[PDB]
Amino acid sequence: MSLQRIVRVSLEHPTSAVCVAGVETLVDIYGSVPEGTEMFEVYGTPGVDIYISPNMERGRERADTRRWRFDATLEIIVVMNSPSNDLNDSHVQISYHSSHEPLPLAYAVLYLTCVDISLDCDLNVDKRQWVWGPSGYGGILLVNCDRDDPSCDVQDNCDQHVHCLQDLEDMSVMVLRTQGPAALFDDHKLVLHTSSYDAKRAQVFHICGPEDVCEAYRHVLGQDKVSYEVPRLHGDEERFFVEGLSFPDAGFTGLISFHVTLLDDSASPIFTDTVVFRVAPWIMTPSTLPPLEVYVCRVRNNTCFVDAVAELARKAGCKLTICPQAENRWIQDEMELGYVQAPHKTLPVVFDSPRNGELQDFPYKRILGPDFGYVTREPRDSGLDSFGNLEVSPPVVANGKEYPLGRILIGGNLPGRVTQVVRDFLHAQKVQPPVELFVDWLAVGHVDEFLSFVPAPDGKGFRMLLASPGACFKLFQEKQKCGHGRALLFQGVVDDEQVKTISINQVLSNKDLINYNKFVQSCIDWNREVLKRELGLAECDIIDIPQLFKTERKKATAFFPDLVNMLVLGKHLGIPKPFGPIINGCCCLEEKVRSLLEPLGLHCTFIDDFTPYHMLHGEVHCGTNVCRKPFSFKWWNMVP
């Protein structure tokens, strides 16, 4: 199951074959044996393993211990597991014998120069193929999309040099052992190389001075450099550092091959070794994971929303990053905070939306720190649904398959959508197979407007919450059956243009509003069945949250503040204050929200956001982004 070579010898002159350590070499002869050959012996220098074996069966046996009856169906295998100290310091001798004369009929001498050449980085086996699963192997290469060097205002993938002392942590090591006699390399070339396609996807740096000098990490393989001649500057081992340049995309499967080759120019190759890296994909974090940093804007009239986000994220231990002006508020539409995982350094990565104009400068300026990669996709042609539309589910099981990193959720329409480049990126990450949903019926049309996952220690670890006009129907009808129909919804709120205060009786007896909410619930029910199919969830995990919808056209906006589309930080969730019907001094919508959520251990704190948001078609989740702790499950044993 190893490399096989056939080196033939001649009874006229000895041969000077060069072999590679560990590789087997079949030994045969040009022409025929002596005329009266009946037996043969074979002998080898210490450190030269000689085995005899029939060509039919595959059982090996030491060959230098007896005089073998001659048989053309036998074959001799020579293996040198250790490199030679000097050229041709070992040899094999085959003598042919007959019972007629006592002396050997003929000799066949083969001198051997053994060289130990191997290229290895981190062999997680064939070493030339990448296989998925817990029993899989292969090296992982990152993309290095961050800024570790403070001198640069640009990305770390752009420089052909390495002018940072800790940027090397983002790269992958690759050791080339080249043990053997030095004079051999006066006759043979050592060439590292890679295909031009892979060369345009990653860069390799040789080392000329260990661990101290930035100029010593000499760039040897890049966009135009497809091959390089390793001078063996350190002796029997050369260290290389490879950094990826791109993420898996529509045309890039995600595998790059690096080869080393020994050439005989005084060129003809006699040995080649390969190493295959897989570019680690971009992984999204659903709301079920523990949060790390909460992001929120501060706009010309954002006064108490920031304070509420602060005093409510301090219960989950978050960093509370704040933006001074946002050039305007929608911090959840411009960026999505995922990560890329490696067995040495897993770093979080921001994905920048092509929905630009307000926060278009925030990610590439003040979000890619030392360990914070940056990736973005802009189409050549336009985005209307963007990263409010992009969410991720918890780990699920559906269609027989298991999704331990969840599935991606984006919206669209069935008969005709998010731009094709973003779709291609998400589908090419291959680790969270996306599920395209129906969101085109909403005004802005983002998935997070009707769907939100929440952690709950029961059932499946989480609950999927869906907005449901029928839930509000049931709640308002059951409250009417008590006599509180004259309770008003928008009663307690700072009214500037005096949004008209509607009552329960007015809402329930408004035919157009009720029919429009029935249509909205039919859309949400279609999405609900698609979610149950593609995520394998039951009604035990699905909770309906009461929510009505306004409209000024054929598309849907929220009637009162959207209860779903909330900020979910582990045990604490910030929900938009619905300003519902006050029945006993407390909002009945808030009472229903508590009755639905707090039995799951969560604590619901409602934020007044009627003036800052919900009048520009957004809620707290629309104004708050968050990055989360990566999954414990590693992405390589995923068997897609």
In the stretch 132-161, what mask flags binding to Ca ion with x, by CB under 5 A?
Answer: ------------x-x-x-------x--x--
* Residues making contact with a copy of itself (CB under 8 A): 4-6, 8, 10, 26, 28-32, 35, 55-56, 73, 261, 263, 267, 269, 272, 414-415, 469-470, 473-474, 477-478, 481, 514, 518, 521-522, 525-526, 528-529, 532-533, 538-540
What's the CA gap between 420 and 378, in Å, rounded? 10
**For residue 385, what is the DSSP state?**
S
Question: Least distance (Å) from ligand BFB to the CB of residue 162?
Answer: 39
Given 24, 448, 544, 562, the residue binding Cl ion (CB under 5 A): 544
Nearest to 570 by CA among 343, 256, 288: 288
| 188 belongs to the binding site for ligand BFB (CB under 6 A) | no
Residue type, 87: L
What would the two tokens of residue 505 be? 């009786």
Which residues face 409 on adjacent strands? 391, 435
What's the CA gap between 47 and 436, in Å, rounded? 63
Count of residues in the chain: 640
Reported as type and span, the H/E element at residue 595 is helix 588-597
| 390 belongs to the binding site for Ca ion (CB under 5 A) | yes
What's the CA gap between 592 and 585, in Å, rounded? 14
How many chain residues are in contact with ligand BFB, going by CB under 6 A?
14
What distance lies between CA 379 and its chain's CA centroid? 22
Question: Least distance (Å) from a copy of itself to the CB of residue 576?
Answer: 24
In the stretch 544-583, what mask flags binding to ligand BFB with x, by CB under 6 A?
Answer: ---------------------x------------------
Touching ligand BFB, residues 449-488 (CB under 6 A): 449
Nearer to a copy of itself, 365 or 481 (CB): 481
| 254 belongs to the binding site for ligand BFB (CB under 6 A) | no
Binding region for ligand BFB (CB under 6 A) out of 198-206, 251-259, 602-610, 617-625: 617-625
What's the CA gap between 22 and 80, in Å, rounded? 6
Question: Least distance (Å) from a copy of itself to the CB of residue 363?
Answer: 33
Nearer to Cl ion, 174 or 467 (CB): 467
Nearer to ligand BFB, 174 or 296 (CB): 296
Q: Answer whether 359's CB lies under 8 Å from 383's CB.
A: no
Neighbours of 212 (CB within 10 A): 7
| 352 belongs to the binding site for Ca ion (CB under 5 A) | yes
Nearest to 258 by CA among 207, 192, 160, 205: 192
> Is 158 in the active site?
no
First to last CA, the chain: 28
Nearest to 503 by CA among 480, 526, 529, 471: 480
What distance lies between CA 472 and its chain's CA centroid? 41
| 346 belongs to the binding site for ligand BFB (CB under 6 A) | no
| 360 belongs to the binding site for Ca ion (CB under 5 A) | yes
Q: Report the partner that residue 170 touches, choosing among Ca ion, ligand BFB, a copy of itself, none (CB closer than 5 to 8 A by kind).
A: Ca ion
Neighbours of 377 (CB within 10 A): 19
Q: Report the partner that residue 528 touches, choosing among Cl ion, ligand BFB, Ca ion, none (CB closer than 5 to 8 A by kind).
A: none
Question: Least distance (Å) from Ca ion to the CB of residue 431?
Answer: 17
| 625 belongs to the binding site for ligand BFB (CB under 6 A) | no
Question: Least distance (Å) from ligand BFB to the CB of residue 478?
Answer: 29
Q: Answer whether 570's CB lies under 8 Å from 290's CB.
A: yes
Q: Report the partner that residue 607 touches, choosing among Cl ion, Ca ion, ligand BFB, none (CB closer than 5 to 8 A by kind).
A: none
| 446 belongs to the binding site for ligand BFB (CB under 6 A) | yes
Q: 630 Cβ partners below 8 Å, 6+ apart?
A: 283, 285, 289, 339, 341, 346, 348
Question: Least distance (Å) from a copy of itself to the CB of residue 539?
Answer: 4
What's the CA gap between 33 and 52, in Å, rounded? 17
Q: Answer whether 6's CB lies under 8 Å from 29's CB.
A: no
In the stretch 370-409, what mask flags binding to ligand BFB with x, by CB under 6 A?
Answer: ------------------x---------------------
Query: What sign has the CA pseudo-torsion 228, 231, 234, 235?
Result: positive
Query: What sign has the CA pseudo-torsion 382, 387, 388, 393?
Result: positive
| 492 belongs to the binding site for Cl ion (CB under 5 A) | yes
Q: Report the partner that residue 88 touches, choosing among a copy of itself, Ca ion, ligand BFB, none (CB closer than 5 to 8 A by kind).
A: none
| 327 belongs to the binding site for Ca ion (CB under 5 A) | no
Given 123, 165, 182, 250, the residue binding Cl ion (CB under 5 A): 250
Nearer to Cl ion, 230 or 428 (CB): 428
Q: What is the DSSP string of 537-560?
A: --TTTEEEEE--EE-SSSSBEESS
Q: Is 524 helix (H, G, I), strand (E, B) or coil?
A: helix
| 249 belongs to the binding site for Ca ion (CB under 5 A) | no
Q: Answer whether 565's CB lies under 8 Å from 619's CB.
A: yes
Q: Answer whether 7's CB lies under 8 Å from 27's CB.
A: yes
Given 312, 444, 502, 504, the residue binding ligand BFB (CB under 6 A): 444
Nearer to Cl ion, 225 or 427 (CB): 427
Q: Report the partner that residue 167 touches, choosing among Ca ion, Cl ion, a copy of itself, none (CB closer than 5 to 8 A by kind).
A: Ca ion
Burial 86-121 (b: 16+ CB within 10 A, else e): ebbebbbbbbbbbeeeeebbeebbbbbbbbbbbbeb
| 436 belongs to the binding site for Cl ion (CB under 5 A) | no
In the stretch 515-554, what mask flags binding to Ca ion with x, by CB under 5 A?
Answer: ----------------------------------------
Q: Which residue out of 114, 318, 323, 622 is catalytically annotated?
A: 622
Give the pairing of strands 391-392 and 408-412. Answer: antiparallel
Nearest to 48 by CA among 108, 111, 118, 3: 111
Given 170, 534, 562, 590, the residue binding Ca ion (CB under 5 A): 170
Q: Which residues bind Ca ion (CB under 5 A)?
A: 144, 146, 148, 156, 159, 162, 167, 170, 352, 356, 360, 387, 390
Q: Which residues bind ligand BFB (CB under 6 A)?
A: 330, 332-333, 388, 444, 446, 448-449, 565, 616-618, 621-622
What residues act catalytically?
A: 622
Q: Which residues bind Cl ion (CB under 5 A)?
A: 7, 250, 427-428, 468, 470, 492, 544
